[PDB]
Amino acid sequence: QNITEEFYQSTCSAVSKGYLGALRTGWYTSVITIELSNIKENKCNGTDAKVKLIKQELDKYKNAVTDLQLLMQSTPATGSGSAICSGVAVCKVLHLEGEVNKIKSALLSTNKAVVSLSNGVSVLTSKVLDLKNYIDKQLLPIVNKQSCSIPNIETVIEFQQKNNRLLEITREFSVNAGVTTPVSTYMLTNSELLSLINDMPITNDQKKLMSNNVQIVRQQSYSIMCIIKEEVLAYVVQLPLYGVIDTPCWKLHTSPLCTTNTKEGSNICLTRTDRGWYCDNAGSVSFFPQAETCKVQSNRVFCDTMNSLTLPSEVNLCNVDIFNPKYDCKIMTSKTDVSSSVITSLGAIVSCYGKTKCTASNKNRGIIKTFSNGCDYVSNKGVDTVSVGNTLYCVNKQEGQSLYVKGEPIINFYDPLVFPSNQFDASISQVNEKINQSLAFIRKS
Amino acid sequence: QNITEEFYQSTCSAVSKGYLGALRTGWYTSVITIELSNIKENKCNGTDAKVKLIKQELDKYKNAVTDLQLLMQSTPATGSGSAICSGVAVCKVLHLEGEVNKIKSALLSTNKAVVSLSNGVSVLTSKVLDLKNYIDKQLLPIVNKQSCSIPNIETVIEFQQKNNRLLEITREFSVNAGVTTPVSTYMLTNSELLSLINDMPITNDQKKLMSNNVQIVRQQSYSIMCIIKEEVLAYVVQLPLYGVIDTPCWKLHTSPLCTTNTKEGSNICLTRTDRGWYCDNAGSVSFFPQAETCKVQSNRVFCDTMNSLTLPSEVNLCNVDIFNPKYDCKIMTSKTDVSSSVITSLGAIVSCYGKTKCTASNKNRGIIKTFSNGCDYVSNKGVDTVSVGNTLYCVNKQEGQSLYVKGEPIINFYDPLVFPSNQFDASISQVNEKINQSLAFIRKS
Amino acid sequence: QNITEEFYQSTCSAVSKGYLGALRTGWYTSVITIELSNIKENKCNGTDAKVKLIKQELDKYKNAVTDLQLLMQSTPATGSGSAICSGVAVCKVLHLEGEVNKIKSALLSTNKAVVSLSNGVSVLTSKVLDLKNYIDKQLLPIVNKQSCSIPNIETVIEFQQKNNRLLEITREFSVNAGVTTPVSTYMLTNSELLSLINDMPITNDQKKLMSNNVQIVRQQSYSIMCIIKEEVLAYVVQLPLYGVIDTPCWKLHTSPLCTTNTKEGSNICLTRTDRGWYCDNAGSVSFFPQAETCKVQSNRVFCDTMNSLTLPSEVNLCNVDIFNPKYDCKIMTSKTDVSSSVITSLGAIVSCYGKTKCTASNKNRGIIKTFSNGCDYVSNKGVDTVSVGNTLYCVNKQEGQSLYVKGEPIINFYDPLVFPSNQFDASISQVNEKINQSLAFIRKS
Numbered sequence A, B, C: 001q002n003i004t005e006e007f008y009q010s011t012c013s014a015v016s017k018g019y020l021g022a023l024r025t026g027w028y029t030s031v032i033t034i035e036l037s038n039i040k041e042n043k044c045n046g047t048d049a050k051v052k053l054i055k056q057e058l059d060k061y062k063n064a065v066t067d068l069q070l071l072m073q074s075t076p077a078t079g080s081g082s083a084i085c086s087g088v089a090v091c092k093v094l095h096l097e098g099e100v101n102k103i104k105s106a107l108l109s110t111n112k113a114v115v116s117l118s119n120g121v122s123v124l125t126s127k128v129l130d131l132k133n134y135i136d137k138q139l140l141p142i143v144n145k146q147s148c149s150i151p152n153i154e155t156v157i158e159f160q161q162k163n164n165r166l167l168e169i170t171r172e173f174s175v176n177a178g179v180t181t182p183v184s185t186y187m188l189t190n191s192e193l194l195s196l197i198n199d200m201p202i203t204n205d206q207k208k209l210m211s212n213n214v215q216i217v218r219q220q221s222y223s224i225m226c227i228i229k230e231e232v233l234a235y236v237v238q239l240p241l242y243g244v245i246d247t248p249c250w251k252l253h254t255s256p257l258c259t260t261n262t263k264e265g266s267n268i269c270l271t272r273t274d275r276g277w278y279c280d281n282a283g284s285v286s287f288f289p290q291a292e293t294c295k296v297q298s299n300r301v302f303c304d305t306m307n308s309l310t311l312p313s314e315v316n317l318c319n320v321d322i323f324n325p326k327y328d329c330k331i332m333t334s335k336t337d338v339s340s341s342v343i344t345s346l347g348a349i350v351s352c353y354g355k356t357k358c359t360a361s362n363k364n365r366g367i368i369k370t371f372s373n374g375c376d377y378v379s380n381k382g383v384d385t386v387s388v389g390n391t392l393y394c395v396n397k398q399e400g401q402s403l404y405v406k407g408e409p410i411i412n413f414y415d416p417l418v419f420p421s422n423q424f425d426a427s428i429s430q431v432n433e434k435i436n437q438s439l440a441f442i443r444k445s
C-alpha cells in the first residue's frame, strides 16, 4: 500500500515501512527433457554444399552431446548445495534404472506430463525440444545410405535453429559446472515458465504474483544438470515457493552519528548495526543482512530465507527506543567522523562532519538546503539530489510520506574520555557496562 | 607522464604517483529507439518450408515484444537507483502522452536526431533498427492474404539477422530487470557508441579520450529499459561525463609492519589503513576504497565519484610524515604476523615474518634477493617474480622510477606490553592517548 | 578415498578430511591464432539479395577486425596482472618484428605447431579458424570485379557460420578489456582444449586429471588478447599447471560458541577463526581463506596458490588441542549469541541460543532431533534437513564417516566479568594475557 519512512534524529537511522514481503520457504522442482538422437557417425562420400552444411551442424550436435556427457560424469560441487537438495534428489532418482524410461513414456504423446517417480514425488515433466524425432526423420535419410541424400536448404536452416537451443544450454551448463542461476530463457522460455506457473499447486493470486514477477522468479531459481541417458537429456529446474505472502517488511538505514567538536581527535562516533531488510515471519522477525538477498518491486519485496537470521520481534524496538531493555540494541563505535550520505526509500540521511560541504538541491532551484555538522535528513518532496563533498547522489522520487522524528543525538550522552571507541558488535548496555568499569578504575584512585 | 613510486620503510607502505585521472561528475543521457511492427497474428494455410521458417521467426519476434511488455509493466528496483535518476527521468518523460510520437516524428526521415522533450532536456535520439518498415514491407504481403505468399530464401535469412538484435536485447533486459551495465554491443554497437561520442557536447580532446577508451566507457555506462509503446521500443543509455580531467592521482599500497622477535606472542603489528586510489579533486582529495571503482589504462585512471569519500588534501601527509598533526593518520593493530606480499605499480612490498621463505627472482638468474624478517621492498628493475611461502607473485614490468625511502619502522617506537593490539579504525594519536591511559593505570600503582 | 569428518564439541568447529588436492604452481601458455583477411572495401553495383547478405556479413567482419584493433591499441590493466605475466610476456614477444611471421610460417601447412620464440620459450601454437583462406578464395571473386559475382546460398550460410566465432570472441574480448576467465568454448573449444591437454608436457595421469575436470581447468585459466597484425589474430591462453598433486587437504568449519545463561547480557561468545581449505604443501600448510579459490569435485580439491597464505604445519594442532603452545590458536570474541547453522561436508553444526527453535529432520520421519542451547552437531546419517529459526538448510548426502569428539565447551573456562568481548584477530594466549592484566587492575585494589 503506502510506503512511509521515519528518520530518527537521535540515532542517525531511518526505517522505510509499508512493503509487502514474499519469503521463499519451499521449492517446486520440475524435470525438463530434450529428446536426443542416438546416432553414431554415418559418413558417405558427400560434397554438395548442402550436405556439408548438414554434417557440420551435425558434428556440433554430437560434440554438444559428448560435452554434456563429460559434464555429467564429474559434476563439481557448488556452495549452493545447501539449497538444491530438492532437485539433486531428483537427479539421483533419475539415475535409477527404468526411471528415465518412465518419463520418456509419459511424454511420448504430449509435451507436458505429471510423473510419479519411484520415490513418491509427483513431479511435473516437460519435453521442450524433440531432436530424436527431427534427426531420425529429417536428417538420417540424408546420411545413412551408400551415398548421402540431398537436403533442401530449408532443412539446413531449420536444423541450425533447432540445434541452437541445445548448443546454448550446453554452454551455460558447461561453464557453471551444471548449476545455473538465474534460469535463462534457454533453460526455460518465458512461455514455458509461465505455463509451468499455471500448472503449479498454488492459489490463483500466487500464480498471478509469480507471473507478474517472472524475472525475480528467475533470479531466485536454479537449473541443475542431471543426466544424458538413453536419448534423453534431463535437468531439474527448481522454482521458489513463497510460504510467506504479504508479510509486513521494512528496511533499516543507518549512518554514523558523531559529535561535532571543532578540535579533531576529540570526537566520538556511533552507528547502529544491522541495517537491511526485516520481515515479520512466523511470530519472529527474519533479518536479511546481505543486499542481494531481497529483490524489490514497488511496495513488494522478494527474499530468500536461506541467508537470513531469525530475531525476536522485539528487535523492532531499536527503532522506537534504543535504550529499551526488552532488546539489547547494538552499535559500533569509532572516532572516524568522515562525511557520508545514505539514499533511503523516500529521502536521504546525511552525516556531515568537519569542513565537508553538504547540501540538498532541486533540479530547477539549485541548493535548497545546507546541512550543518551532525546527522540530518531530508525528504524527497522537492529534493532531487544530495551532494556530500565531491559526491552527488540521486534521491528516489517514489511517492510516500516521510516523518522527521526529532530527538537528542544519543552520542551526546557519553563522556568522551571514557567512551569505548573500538567496538564492532557491541550492545548499548555493553558500552554502559564498559563505562561503569572504566569509570571505576579512575574513580577509586 | 612518468609513473613513479615511493616505498616508505618506516610504515610498510608505498605510493604510486604520476597517473592522470578522469572522474565521472555528470551523465549524458541518450534515447535509443527500435521501430517495431504492430501486428497481430495473421495465419493462413501455409506449409511450404519457407513460410514455416518465416512464421517461426515471426513468433520469436512476437514473444520478444510481449516479453518486453511484461518487463516494462513491473520493473524491479536496483541498488543503482542513486546513479540513474538522469535516465529514469527520461523514461518517466517518455511515458507522457504524445512524447513518444515526438521522437517518432523526429526520426521519421533520418536515424539520428536531437529532440527537445517536454521537460527542457535536449536529448539525442537514435533509431538503431527499423523493424516496422521491414516487417510491414517484406513480411506482411507474405502472411496477410487468404493463402500466404511465398518468400524467397534470402528474406528468411535476412529476417533472422534483423530479428537477432531484438532477441538479444530482450535477453539482456530480461535477466537484469531492465538495467544493464556495462552496455553491450547489442545495446549499442561500437560504431553507434563512437558516433554518439562525436555528437556529444564535449571538447575534441575529450571525445578523443572516450573514443580511445570505449571499453572503460561501456563499463561505466548504463542501459535502462523505458517503454514499448506505439510501435516504438525505447531505452535510455546513460554515458559518463568526466567533469574532472587530467587530475593528479596516486595509489596507496599498505602491508603489515610487525616486530621481529623470536618468541611468538611477543610481537605487535601495525598496518596503515585506507589503501587504494586518491585523486586531487576540487580543492579536496577523492578517495576510492573499492577496487573496481577505478579502471586503469597505462598512466590514466577512470574513477566514478559515486563510491568515493571526500578527504582533506592533508591526507597526503600520511605518506611523508605519519606522526604529523595536520592530519590524524589512522592504522589498524594486531598481533598477526603472517607473511604476505603486495604487488605495487613498479615493484613489491614484502612482509616476511617467522620462518617464511621470502625471495625475489629474475627469470634467468634465479633468486636475486632474500628478504629477512620485517617489511621490505624491491623494484621491478631486474625482478620478475616474488615468492612468499608457497605463493609466487608476478611483478608488473611497467617502466617507471622507484625510490626506496629509508626510515626506522615505527612499530619499534611502541612498548609491547601497553600496545593496543585490537584496533580497526584507530588514529596514531588515538593509540598514543590509549597508551597514556594504560600507562597511567599502572604508573600510579 | 574416504571422506571423514570430526566435530569438536569443545570449540564448536568441525574438520572434513580425506580430500586429495591439486594446487596450481605453474602456468602453461599457448598461442591461439586466427588467420584473417587483409581486405579493404571492395564495393560494386550489387543488389541481388545474396550479394547484399554477403556484403552485410562482410561488414560485420570488418567491424570485428577494427574493434579488435582499437582493443589492442589501449588495453586496460586488470587486478589479475600478478597472475598473467606468463602470457603477457608472450604478447610482448609477439609484438616483435618478424615473430608473428614465424608462427604464421609454422602453421602454414598444419593447424598445430610448436614454435621456439625469440625469447627461448617453446610455446604451442594453434590455428583454430582460417578466414584468410576462406575470404580470399570464396568471397573475393564475388566482390572484386567491375560488377560483383553471384554467390550460391550455401556460401552465405557458411560464411555466417565461420564469421560467428570471430564475432563472439570479439564480444568477450571487448567487454573484459582483453582478459577473460574462465575461458569459454569460443576462446577454445572443448575439443581444442582436450587436444591441447594431450600435447602438454605432463604425466598421463595428470592429463587424465585435467581432461576429467575440464570445467575446473577453464575456471582457472586465462585468455589474454595480444595483437591483430599482418592477417593474424593472436591471443594467449594460460592453462594451470598443478605442481602439487594428491596432497592431503581438509576443510575447517567454525561456528559461535556462547554460554547459555538465561539473562541476556551475561553471555560471552567465542569463534575460531580461519575457516576454509587447508592443504599440505611443501613442508608447510597452504591456507585458502576465500571460498571461490578452491573448486571441489567429490574427494578432490583444485586450489590456486595465488590467494593463499603459508602457515606452519602446527596450525593443524588447533583442531586437536586449541590450548596447545606449539601454535597460537586464534579466536574472535563477542557477546552476540545469535543462532546459526553451518552445513559441513558430512553433517551440520548448530549454534542455538535464546528462544530459537533448532531441529534436525528426516524427510519421512519429521523432526528427529531437537537441539538445546549451545553448540552441537548432527551427522548426515538419517538427517535430511536442519532448521534454525525460520531457515531450513539441506544437509549434504555424501557418504563418509562422522566422529563426534565430546569435550567441555572452552567458553566455560572464562570468567564473564573479565572476558575480552571485543577481539577480531586475537590469540588464545592473547586473551589469557589480557585476562591476567584485567585481573591485575582489580586484584591489587
Ligand SMILES: *[C@@H]1O[C@H](CO)[C@@H](O)[C@H](O)[C@H]1NC(C)=O
Pocket: A429, A430, A432, A433, A434, A436
Ligand atoms: C552501570 O551503572 C548504573 C548505576 O547503577 C546501572 O544502573 C547500569 O545498569 C549499569 N550498566 C550495566 C551494563 O551494568
Ligand SMILES: *[C@@H]1O[C@H](CO)[C@@H](O)[C@H](O)[C@H]1NC(C)=O
Pocket: B429, B430, B432, B433, B434, B436
Ligand atoms: C600523551 O602524553 C604526551 C605527554 O604529555 C603528550 O605529548 C601526547 O600528546 C599525549 N597523547 C594524546 C593523544 O593525548
Ligand SMILES: *[C@@H]1O[C@H](CO)[C@@H](O)[C@H](O)[C@H]1NC(C)=O
Pocket: C429, C430, C432, C433, C434, C436
Ligand atoms: C597468565 O598467568 C598465568 C599464571 O602465571 C600464566 O601461566 C599464563 O601463561 C599467563 N598468560 C600469558 C598470556 O602470559
